[PDB]
Every structure is written in structure tokens, then in C-alpha cells.
Design a protein around this ligand. Structure first.
Ligand SMILES: [Mg+2]
Ligand SMILES: [Mg+2]
Ligand SMILES: [Mg+2]
Ligand SMILES: [Mg+2]
Ligand SMILES: [Mg+2]
Ligand SMILES: [Mg+2]
Ligand SMILES: [Mg+2]
Ligand SMILES: [Mg+2]
Ligand SMILES: [Mg+2]
Ligand SMILES: [Mg+2]
Ligand SMILES: [Mg+2]
Ligand SMILES: [Mg+2]
Ligand SMILES: [Mg+2]
Ligand SMILES: [Mg+2]
Ligand SMILES: [Mg+2]
Ligand SMILES: [Mg+2]
Ligand SMILES: [Mg+2]
Ligand SMILES: [Mg+2]
Ligand SMILES: [Mg+2]
Ligand SMILES: [Mg+2]
Ligand SMILES: [Mg+2]
Ligand SMILES: [Mg+2]
Ligand SMILES: [Mg+2]
Ligand SMILES: [Mg+2]
Ligand SMILES: [Mg+2]
Ligand SMILES: [Mg+2]
Ligand SMILES: [Mg+2]
Ligand SMILES: [Mg+2]
Ligand SMILES: [Mg+2]
Ligand SMILES: [Mg+2]
Ligand SMILES: [Mg+2]
Ligand SMILES: [Mg+2]
Ligand SMILES: [Mg+2]
Ligand SMILES: [Mg+2]
Ligand SMILES: [Mg+2]
Ligand SMILES: [Mg+2]
Ligand SMILES: [Mg+2]
Ligand SMILES: [Mg+2]
Ligand SMILES: [Mg+2]
Ligand SMILES: [Mg+2]
Ligand SMILES: [Mg+2]
Ligand SMILES: [Mg+2]
Ligand SMILES: [Mg+2]
Ligand SMILES: [Mg+2]
Ligand SMILES: [Mg+2]
Ligand SMILES: [Mg+2]
Ligand SMILES: [Mg+2]
Ligand SMILES: [Mg+2]
Ligand SMILES: [Mg+2]
Ligand SMILES: [Mg+2]
Ligand SMILES: [Mg+2]
Ligand SMILES: [Mg+2]
Ligand SMILES: [Mg+2]
Ligand SMILES: [Mg+2]
Ligand SMILES: [Mg+2]
Ligand SMILES: [Mg+2]
Ligand SMILES: [Mg+2]
Ligand SMILES: [Mg+2]
Ligand SMILES: [Mg+2]
Ligand SMILES: [Mg+2]
Ligand SMILES: [Mg+2]
Ligand SMILES: [Mg+2]
Ligand SMILES: [Mg+2]
Ligand SMILES: [Mg+2]
Ligand SMILES: [Mg+2]
Ligand SMILES: [Mg+2]
Ligand SMILES: [Mg+2]
Ligand SMILES: [Mg+2]
Ligand SMILES: [Mg+2]
Ligand SMILES: [Mg+2]
Ligand SMILES: [Mg+2]
Ligand SMILES: [Mg+2]
Ligand SMILES: [Mg+2]
Ligand SMILES: [Mg+2]
Ligand SMILES: [Mg+2]
Ligand SMILES: [Mg+2]
Ligand SMILES: [Mg+2]
Ligand SMILES: [Mg+2]
Ligand SMILES: [Zn+2]
Lengths: 50, 100, 77, 112, 91
RNA sequence: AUGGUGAACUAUGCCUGAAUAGGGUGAAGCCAGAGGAAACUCUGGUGGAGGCUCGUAGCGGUUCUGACGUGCAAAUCGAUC
RNA sequence: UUCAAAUGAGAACUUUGAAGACUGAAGUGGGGAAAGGUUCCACGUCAACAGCAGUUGGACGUGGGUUAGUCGAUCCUAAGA
RNA sequence: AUAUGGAUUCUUCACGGUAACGUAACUGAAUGUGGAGACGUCGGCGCGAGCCCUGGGAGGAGUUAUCUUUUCUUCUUAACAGCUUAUCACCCCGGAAUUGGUUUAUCCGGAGAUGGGGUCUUAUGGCUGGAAGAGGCCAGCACCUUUGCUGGCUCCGGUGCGCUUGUGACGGCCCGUGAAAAUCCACAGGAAGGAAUAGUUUUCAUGCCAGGUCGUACUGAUAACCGCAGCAGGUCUCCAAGGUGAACAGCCUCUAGUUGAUAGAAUAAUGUAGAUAAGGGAAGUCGGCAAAAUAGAUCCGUAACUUCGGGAUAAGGAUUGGCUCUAAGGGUCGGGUACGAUCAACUUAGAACUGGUACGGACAAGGGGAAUCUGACUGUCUAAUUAAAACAUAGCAUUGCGAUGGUCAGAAAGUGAUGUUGACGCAAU
């Protein structure tokens, strides 16, 4: 890093949008079943493997 | 090649407030100013006077304004007048004693 | 980035088609050793270089400043 | 006491990464990167730095009035003049001898 | 004042390699570093520069030569043999 | 047994880069001088040689059969080297 | 390591002032390559996490932030492919 | 993209200089050729920059029982541009034994020295432009504010085996002689095009438009990377202050940064880590394991043996602080065609005095000696129980091979290694 390829900037940027908690309004829909976000990620817990 | 330099200090502002005695003060200069290495040897090479409200020094021997600030700091400390008065250059070589 | 000395070449610079603006500068300085004197630099700004003409004589400067094209944008000091 | 940092992302000490410490109007020390040095062009005959010709890294020779890249003589900016001297002399003399070689063996054939 | 009874330039090698070997080198080293007479301009300025190559200080001529010395004993006989044989062809 | 995946560790070659306080020794070459009938021999300098030497960084890993041995650590830590 | 203040339900651990020390320019200073990918900064803020703690954080919530004719890439060729 | 100015031409494609060469310009197709890109390492020596040290002056700060014309600190100048600046190299004059010139380092000259006079490279530096308007340091007024507002000063020098880096002219080394291409210029060439009623000229000046795409945060580590982790491990590099000292050592400091690592009370046994111990001195033990001893520098003094290079710091000795003096060692100038004047350095030897005989006063820093065995040496390996006498090595010797070949690769092949090779070679022991 520190001087990256646009391919990698993307995945990096895509991964930044996926790093939010559940939108709580979803919690309210009929039959809704998703308690929490089970696909979250931390920079110092799981590495992206590029 | 010889040169004769002058040094003015406006001692008014603390003189008027009583806590300053341009008398014994110019006297401090007059015999603790070092002249090729010792006191008193002001041998018509340097002069100290007072204009009642102003001190004057004129030199022909090695004497810098940094020296003149060193001495009065010492006088001002010898008589407890620190906290109350500062030595300050107003204009180049024109000094004074600021009170407040 | 360029210095000038010909006080005729100077004048013609200030009448160049691209020379929009110019500025006049005043430094107090000193002479030989004894005393001071008032210096004056005449900077003209071309599309690709700032020509500046130092005139060390106070007199020559006062006459020069009037020679300036009245359509020129002068920045005094 | 005042230290200094490279001004480019390259952190290593290479020929294209030479530094030069400098005092700015700010009163601070600062690195400045320094282009590699120019070397003098040379005589393609004798091999010396060929005099009268200016020296700058190669592409900089295209930003220069033609006089900086030449001297005003036969084979000017290209050979060292004492080289030109030589190849004039040898030219003349060998062209001459060519005459002495011909008419001489023109006699051989006639006296044989 | 003389510094070494015998080892000469070979004195860099200290105590190592065995005397005999230093001798063999020294002989050849003295040959290679030595300064030689130029056939062409006549000054003793021919000095070596990597095995086989011999070049004149001034006048800048370069002769191909022996590995450690300028003229191989062999090569020089050869120079003469060719002399001889050549001669036959005109006369 | 069949078909695949590895030289990010490591082994070796190539290509292109980078790195190494201060000391000791004093090899060729060079200058001046001394003796001697001669052949030749000596002295003082200068100079800066080496898979040379003292020793940091570096690289290594000798001993304590030291620490630790449910560790800081699936090989580390200390001193010594 | 210490005294105080401030903050807070709560302060051995946060902020600030004071004191004592440390690294000692071969750095515990100032920057970068590889690698990470937002950790950078601000505001909010402690359920879990930081093997005592917590009002603090590389944690949590929510936002903001990376500007180039000249710095790199891009072009060149190296071993090789 | 181009337009004006200048330069050039009735001798069409410039002049000047004896010459090295000069310059604001001063046409040039194919084609060829030359240079630059472009190159090892070490050594000393020369110079540059930044740093270090330091005098005077102007400021601000610190200490002041006492002492110190004191301690600390500010005083700066970018790219780019003009002029000027060089060791080297070269030109002109001239003609050399009584040989001279000359580096720290011994090279140079009748293939033209020493001498005089010139020419070039612009590394580098100087002064001016940029540029004081910036920046830096102060004082003197204002007020919740945005935050101003007004004045000043920013000057002149010194030193060098200093440190770091840059660089030049040289020297050593090699069976090692230490990339390539893109790219830019030059020259040889002369096809061609081009003037007097007006042409040629954009390598001289000035002028106009344009410059996309992707990366740009931060960590870089005793918490941002890899070791299941905020792991005492691992992980490529630049910058680098003062003292002491030989020093980028250790030890203390400035600047900057930390003050992170659960805490409290006690100090039993046994520990881990750091120390001392009377008399004796290895009697301990497989074994002096561990520990102790030694140590710098100056001087003196040094054996067998030896491949003559070493062995060697052999061994063995003495000395060392503070302070106060003496002597030696240098630079710069004017001398008709003997000396005078000043400036700025730590080295080295000596001599006094001095102390609870101490002084490399901490830090730092070799134990020596006589043999046997074994490997010549330096070098290498079992990452994680073996570093050795084991491997390598130069040296010695043997073998194969002249290319329709030796040796070796492949399933094959219009295939491949040695081979950019040729017996002073490659291959195999
Ligand atoms: Mg950067
Ligand atoms: Mg290098
Ligand atoms: Mg590059
Ligand atoms: Mg020229
Ligand atoms: Mg020129
Ligand atoms: Mg690899
Ligand atoms: Mg060294
Ligand atoms: Mg030593
Ligand atoms: Mg050494
Ligand atoms: Mg005699
Ligand atoms: Mg040496
Ligand atoms: Mg060695
Ligand atoms: Mg050693
Ligand atoms: Mg040492
Ligand atoms: Mg180590
Ligand atoms: Mg090793
Ligand atoms: Mg160990
Ligand atoms: Mg153990
Ligand atoms: Mg245990
Ligand atoms: Mg060691
Ligand atoms: Mg604490
Ligand atoms: Mg605190
Ligand atoms: Mg300390
Ligand atoms: Mg250190
Ligand atoms: Mg830390
Ligand atoms: Mg990261
Ligand atoms: Mg975010
Ligand atoms: Mg943060
Ligand atoms: Mg909690
Ligand atoms: Mg955590
Ligand atoms: Mg906890
Ligand atoms: Mg808790
Ligand atoms: Mg967040
Ligand atoms: Mg560039
Ligand atoms: Mg591109
Ligand atoms: Mg002309
Ligand atoms: Mg070419
Ligand atoms: Mg070439
Ligand atoms: Mg290269
Ligand atoms: Mg300073
Ligand atoms: Mg530039
Ligand atoms: Mg001359
Ligand atoms: Mg002349
Ligand atoms: Mg010297
Ligand atoms: Mg370095
Ligand atoms: Mg060479
Ligand atoms: Mg060229
Ligand atoms: Mg042009
Ligand atoms: Mg395009
Ligand atoms: Mg950045
Ligand atoms: Mg950073
Ligand atoms: Mg960190
Ligand atoms: Mg990790
Ligand atoms: Mg993982
Ligand atoms: Mg760790
Ligand atoms: Mg930090
Ligand atoms: Mg702990
Ligand atoms: Mg405890
Ligand atoms: Mg005892
Ligand atoms: Mg005893
Ligand atoms: Mg005994
Ligand atoms: Mg026993
Ligand atoms: Mg035994
Ligand atoms: Mg026994
Ligand atoms: Mg032991
Ligand atoms: Mg003892
Ligand atoms: Mg023996
Ligand atoms: Mg011995
Ligand atoms: Mg004494
Ligand atoms: Mg003297
Ligand atoms: Mg004198
Ligand atoms: Mg061995
Ligand atoms: Mg092992
Ligand atoms: Mg194993
Ligand atoms: Mg070993
Ligand atoms: Mg072992
Ligand atoms: Mg043998
Ligand atoms: Mg076939
Ligand atoms: Zn010759």
C-alpha cells in the first residue's frame, strides 16, 4: 500500500461501505429475521487477503 | 577609528512613582562599570550623568548596550525593584525604564 | 527574474503589448559607509518574466515615475 | 541539530536520489534533490573532453542555442582540432602520394 | 633502508600459501606491474591493464601481449619464424 | 497409485540496488644519506599492500550443559563468545 | 514515579499545571519501501474489547478528510517471460 | 500555433581571433559517423556545501548574599536568471646538460620542458535580480469579538588533520577490468530552396493556446506488517547536536518524544539476577565448569622456532592526577635590477610546586607460558540437541574430447545446457 492500484483502491472502498451496522429499520419489517449484521469486519481482526 | 558612543535611559516613569532614585542609581554605574577589566578606571574614557529625568552614558572604551542592560538589571535587583521595573530598548540605543 | 539597467530599454518594456501591470518599490538603504539614501526598483511584469530596474538616485526616480504610460496598472509600494 | 527528510517516496540512497541540504528564506534546513552530474562530451578521435562545447545531461542539449554545442571549425563540435590538424595533414599527403604512386608505376610498365 | 630480505612485493601475503607459491607469484607479479619500453614512440611507459593488454601512457597505443609480461618468448620466436617464411615468398 | 499446488521460509545461479565507528601492522614504488679497492652492503625517510590484525554496527551462534521450559517465544532471553 | 486542580455517579490510570526522571541523535526524534486499509481527524461515547481500571483508545456510534504539465506510475531496456 | 523585433543577402546561406576559440542569431534532405544516456572497489590529498566552534554590535530571556563587560537565545535568503568564477585540458612565443619543472604520494620534456602570454569546460563560488514586500526577533498602543493597529531591528567578522556529505586531480588491485535500451545533441555529406525593387531566415529575443489517466490519508512497529494476540521474536533504508575519549564506543547533556509495562503492605524459606568475604589456593570437579585476574597509552625490554613474511601486545618492566612555567614546531604582506610587520593553532618533549602515593580514579579495556593430537591458513553445514578433526580451498595428479565431438537435458522434435565456448578449453574423478 501507500501507493496503490485503482483495482485495490476499489475493493478497499467497497469494503468501507460494507462496514456499517444493521440499519435498524430493517429490524421492524414483517417476518424480519436478521437480528444483527453477521458479516461485519475489523481492520485488526480479519485481514482482507487483498 | 576611535569612535564615541552614547546611551540614553529614560528613568522618569519609575522615578516619578518614588520607588526610584536616579541619584544612587547613576552612582551604581559610576563605579561598577568595568574599564579594561576593573571598577573606577572610567579614566575620562567614559562618562555618566543625569538630566534629572534622564541618564546619559558616553563611552570611548569597550562598552556595549548589552552591558548597560546587564548592570541596571543588577541595580534593579540589588534594591528589589524587579517585578516593578524593566530595562527596555525603545529605539536603537534609546532605552528606558518601564514601570507598571 | 531579470534585472535591467538601460533606462531607455526600460521605457520601451512598459509599452509592450503584453505588459499589463507593474509595481514600484521603495527601500531605505545606506551609502558607501557614512549615511543612508532612498532606493527604488521599477518592476514590470511580462507574460513570462519580471523585469526590474533599480534606480539608485532619488532624483531620477521622481522623473521616471511620470514617464510611465497612464494606461499602465502601477502598484505603488 | 536540524535534520532532514527525502522529498520523494523513494527512501534509498541511489544515483537518481542524491540530496543536498539547504537553508531557505524560512530559516529552515531542507533537502533538495540534485540531478545527476553532466559529463563533458568527447572527441570521437582522440578521446578527450572536447573543448569549447558546453555540458549538460543529453536531452538538455536540445534546449540550447546551437553555438553551445559547437566550435567554428571543420569538424567543429566533433573532434579535438589537434585531431583535425592530423587528418588534414594525412589527407593532403596521402592524396599527393597517390600521384607519386601512379606516374611512377606508369613508368614501370613503359620500362619493362 | 631495505625492508625485506626476500619476499619483496610478495610481502602482502604474510605467512600464507607456502613460500614456494609466493615465489612463483612474485616472479610473475614483478613482470606484470613493471613499466615497459614502447616500440612506437620510445618512452618507457607501457603498463599492463588486465591480462594480455599492454598500453602506452602517452601516445596511447595498445599492444596485445603476454598475460603477465609484454612479449611471450614463444610469440617472439613466432615473430621470427614468420619473418623467415615471409622472405621466401618475395625472394 | 493418479492428477494437481507451492522457492512469501529456505537452497543455489542470474539481473538490478543498497550497506560496513575508530584503532594496530607498515608490503612494492619513491627520495636523501653512510661504508667499501672493487663487487657490493648498510641507515633515515616517504608511501599505503593484505580472502592481515584489535574491535563496534553488521553477520554468526561457543559455553554457562545460565534464564525460560503449561515460556515473551512451537527456538526466545541474558552473559560470554 | 510524585503533589495538586479540573472533569465525572465513580479517577493509582483521563485532561491540565507542577515536580522527578528517561530515551541521548547508531533515538523512545523526523520520514519512507513492503504489508495493512481508514487505523488518519472531529463529535458522541463504554455493553463487549485493551488478562487491574477506565470518564481514555488503534475499541463503539456518527460524520469529515487524500487536489499535481514539473512527485511517482505511465516510457526504456536487465536476468527472464 | 504562429506574428513583430533583431540577425542575414547586391561577395546570397554572419563575422572575428596567428591559434586554441569567440558570439544573440547566423539555412541543410537522404546517408554515414561521433558523443552523451553509460557505469568496479579501496587509498590518501585538494576544494565545495550543511553542521560544529568563535569575535564585535543590536535585541529578548536566565542568575545576581556574593561573583561573572555573564548564561541562554534571534540576526535567514529557494528554484530560476544576468555577470563573473576551475583543477584539468589546449594554443602562441620560445628552444632546454650545470638538466630543469614537480606531488603527501616520482612523474614530466627535442613527439618541444621550465618561462611568459592567452583559449575552454562552469562542478563550485561571488555580487546583483528573485527579495524584503517574505521570514525571524522585539517594543509601543487598542478590546467580548473577526482580532487587528503603529513603530522599529534583521549588521560586521574569525578559525580548521573538525564532523557529515558532495566533488576533482591522482594512485593501488585483478586468470575479477566492474549493464542494456529508450532517448538527446553534434559532425561528415550537399539533394535541394533561396536576393535588389526585394527575398531567405524560427537552434536570437518577445508573443498565444494546451498538458489527460491512476496513486496522494495514516502506521512502518516492545500496539496499525508477519509470528492464532496490543507476542521481550522477525521485518529494506535516509537525516544526525555539545562534553569526555582514538571514535558513529561507553557515560552525561540540548532539540524533539516518552514517562506506556495492574496496584498496595511486608521483606520468612527456596530462588532469579547483582556483590563481598579472614587464612589456604584447585585440596573441589570428568574437566578450573563458573568466577577471579589482566587490560588504555608513553617509554624500556623481549625466547624456541620460522616458509624470513612472522612468532610479538611474546614474556617482563616503569610511568600516568591537579596546577604552575620553559622550549620546539607555522601563515600573510611591501624589499634597488640581513631583517622588519602582525594574525591564528593543539601537539610534543622538558622543569617546578602540590596531595592521607593518589591519578586509563566512572566508563572503557588482551591473562600469560611450555608441550602433544589434529586440520595448513581465511572461508562452509545439520534453521530447532553435533561448528568439529567433517565440507570447501589454493596446490598436486588422473581421465574424456578437435564439433559428424566429450559430458549432460527431453515423450518427441527443423529441441536443449556447456557455448558470446575450442585443449592456456569444457567436461569427469
Ligand atoms: Mg514524501
Ligand atoms: Mg555506491
Ligand atoms: Mg528510477
Ligand atoms: Mg562554443
Ligand atoms: Mg560556451
Ligand atoms: Mg526470493
Ligand atoms: Mg573503517
Ligand atoms: Mg587497539
Ligand atoms: Mg581496519
Ligand atoms: Mg666513498
Ligand atoms: Mg591499511
Ligand atoms: Mg580478516
Ligand atoms: Mg579478527
Ligand atoms: Mg576498542
Ligand atoms: Mg547480535
Ligand atoms: Mg559468518
Ligand atoms: Mg544464547
Ligand atoms: Mg540450558
Ligand atoms: Mg519452572
Ligand atoms: Mg564480539
Ligand atoms: Mg501508573
Ligand atoms: Mg499526567
Ligand atoms: Mg540520560
Ligand atoms: Mg551510541
Ligand atoms: Mg514505545
Ligand atoms: Mg494496518
Ligand atoms: Mg469511517
Ligand atoms: Mg486517533
Ligand atoms: Mg464497563
Ligand atoms: Mg483491542
Ligand atoms: Mg481489562
Ligand atoms: Mg470493566
Ligand atoms: Mg469510527
Ligand atoms: Mg520527473
Ligand atoms: Mg502516460
Ligand atoms: Mg553578426
Ligand atoms: Mg549513434
Ligand atoms: Mg557510447
Ligand atoms: Mg547503471
Ligand atoms: Mg545556533
Ligand atoms: Mg531545478
Ligand atoms: Mg599560464
Ligand atoms: Mg596570445
Ligand atoms: Mg593535511
Ligand atoms: Mg551514509
Ligand atoms: Mg579501469
Ligand atoms: Mg553532444
Ligand atoms: Mg526559440
Ligand atoms: Mg493523445
Ligand atoms: Mg503524506
Ligand atoms: Mg508517515
Ligand atoms: Mg504505533
Ligand atoms: Mg497482525
Ligand atoms: Mg490469520
Ligand atoms: Mg512484538
Ligand atoms: Mg510517533
Ligand atoms: Mg507485564
Ligand atoms: Mg507487587
Ligand atoms: Mg578467601
Ligand atoms: Mg599464592
Ligand atoms: Mg599447583
Ligand atoms: Mg583432582
Ligand atoms: Mg576428561
Ligand atoms: Mg579424572
Ligand atoms: Mg570460563
Ligand atoms: Mg580482589
Ligand atoms: Mg610450533
Ligand atoms: Mg608464544
Ligand atoms: Mg607529574
Ligand atoms: Mg613559538
Ligand atoms: Mg611570527
Ligand atoms: Mg580448519
Ligand atoms: Mg542443530
Ligand atoms: Mg532435522
Ligand atoms: Mg567454528
Ligand atoms: Mg550448537
Ligand atoms: Mg602437498
Ligand atoms: Mg523434425
Ligand atoms: Zn608510446
Amino acid at each position: 500500500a501507500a501507493q496503490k492500484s485503482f483495482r485495490i483502491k476499489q475493493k478497499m472502498a467497497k469494503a468501507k461501505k460494507q462496514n456499517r451496522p444493521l440499519p435498524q429499520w430493517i429490524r421492524l419489517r414483517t417476518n424480519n429475521t436478521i437480528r444483527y449484521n453477521a458479516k461485519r469486519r475489523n481492520w485488526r481482526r480479519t485481514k482482507m487477503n487483498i | 577609528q576611535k569612535i564615541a558612543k552614547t546611551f540614553t535611559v529614560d528613568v522618569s516613569s519609575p522615578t516619578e512613582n518614588g520607588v526610584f532614585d536616579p541619584a544612587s542609581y547613576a552612582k551604581y554605574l559610576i563605579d561598577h562599570i568595568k574599564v579594561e577589566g576593573a571598577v573606577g578606571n572610567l579614566g575620562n574614557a567614559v562618562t555618566v550623568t543625569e538630566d534629572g529625568t534622564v541618564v546619559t552614558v558616553v563611552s570611548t572604551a569597550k562598552f556595549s548596550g548589552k552591558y548597560l542592560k546587564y548592570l541596571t538589571k543588577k541595580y534593579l535587583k540589588k534594591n528589589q525593584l524587579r517585578d516593578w521595573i524593566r530595562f527596555v530598548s525603545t529605539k536603537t540605543n534609546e532605552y528606558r525604564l518601564a514601570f507598571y | 527574474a531579470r534585472e535591467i539597467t538601460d533606462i531607455k530599454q526600460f521605457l520601451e518594456l512598459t509599452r509592450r503589448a503584453d505588459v499589463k501591470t507593474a509595481t514600484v518599490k521603495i527601500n531605505k538603504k545606506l551609502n558607501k559607509a557614512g549615511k543612508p539614501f532612498r532606493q527604488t526598483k521599477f518592476k514590470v511584469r511580462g507574460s513570462s518574466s519580471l523585469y526590474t530596474l533599480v534606480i539608485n538616485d532619488a532624483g531620477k526616480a521622481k522623473k521616471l515615475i511620470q514617464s510611465l504610460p497612464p494606461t499602465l496598472k502601477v502598484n505603488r509600494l | 541539530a536540524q535534520r532532514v527528510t527525502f522529498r520523494r517516496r523513494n527512501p534509498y540512497n541511489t544515483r537518481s536520489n542524491k540530496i543536498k541540504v539547504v537553508k531557505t528564506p524560512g530559516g529552515i534546513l531542507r533537502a533538495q534533490h540534485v540531478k545527476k552530474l553532466a559529463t563533458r562530451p568527447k572527441c570521437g578521435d582522440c578521446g578527450s573532453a572536447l573543448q569549447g562545447i558546453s555540458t549538460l545531461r543529453p536531452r538538455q542539449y536540445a534546449t540550447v542555442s546551437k553555438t553551445h554545442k559547437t566550435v567554428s571549425r571543420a569538424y567543429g563540435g566533433s573532434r579535438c582540432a589537434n585531431c583535425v590538424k592530423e587528418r588534414i595533414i594525412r589527407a593532403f599527403l596521402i592524396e599527393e602520394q597517390k600521384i607519386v604512386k601512379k606516374v611512377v608505376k606508369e613508368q614501370t610498365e613503359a620500362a619493362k | 633502508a631495505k625492508r625485506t630480505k626476500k619476499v619483496g612485493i610478495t610481502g602482502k601475503y604474510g605467512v600464507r600459501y607456502g613460500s614456494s607459491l609466493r615465489r612463483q607469484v612474485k616472479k610473475l607479479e614483478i613482470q606484470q606491474h613493471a613499466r615497459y619500453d614502447c616500440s612506437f614512440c620510445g618512452k618507457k611507459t607501457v603498463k599492463r591493464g588486465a591480462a594480455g593488454i599492454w598500453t602506452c601512457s602517452c601516445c596511447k597505443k595498445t599492444v596485445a601481449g603476454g598475460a603477465y609480461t609484454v612479449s611471450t618468448a614463444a610469440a617472439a620466436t613466432v615473430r621470427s619464424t614468420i619473418r623467415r617464411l615471409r622472405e621466401m615468398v618475395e625472394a
